[PDB]
Every structure is written in structure tokens, then in C-alpha cells.
């Protein structure tokens, strides 16, 4: 068999899922400061009851 047809190949672009990605979370940013003022306050205001 010979053919008079001209081929053409089209495959659909497959699905692709995007997972959530973060370089730094806000908890790491809150921990970036050398002294979280709030936690220092809460610790130091327990001295009499401790």
C-alpha cells in the first residue's frame, strides 16, 4: 500500500498541578528577630507568681 495522505501529529498539552511553595514562612520571619518583644514580656512578668 502507498498513501496519498500527509501525516500530522498533535498531542494535547498534559495537565500540570502547581503545589504551594514558600521560600520563608511568616513564622520564620517572626523568628528572624533576635528578641520577640512579646515573648520576653510574657516570660518576665511571671517572676512574682513563679
Ligand X SMILES: *[C@@H]1O[C@H](CO)[C@@H](O[C@@H]2O[C@H](CO)[C@@H](O)[C@H](O)[C@H]2NC(C)=O)[C@H](O)[C@H]1NC(C)=O
Contact 36, 28 (CB under 8 A): no
| Cβ proximity to ligand X, 11 vs 38, nearer residue | 11
Cβ within 8 Å of residue 30, ≥6 positions away = 36
Q: Is 9 in the site for ligand X (CB under 6 A)?
A: yes
- Angle (nearest 5°) at CA 42 between 36 and 43: 90
**What residue 11 binds from other proteins, ligand X, none (CB within 5 to 8 A, per partner kind)?**
ligand X
Give the interface with ligand X as residue ranges (CB under 6 A): 9, 11
Give the interface with other proteins as residue ranges (CB under 8 A): 1-5, 26
Amino acid at each position: 500500500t502507498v498513501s496519498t495522505f500527509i501525516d500530522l501529529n498533535i498531542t494535547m498539552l498534559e495537565d500540570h498541578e502547581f503545589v504551594p511553595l514558600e521560600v520563608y514562612t511568616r513564622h520564620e520571619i517572626k523568628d528572624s528577630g533576635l528578641l520577640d518583644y512579646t515573648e520576653v514580656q510574657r516570660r518576665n512578668q511571671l517572676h512574682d507568681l513563679r
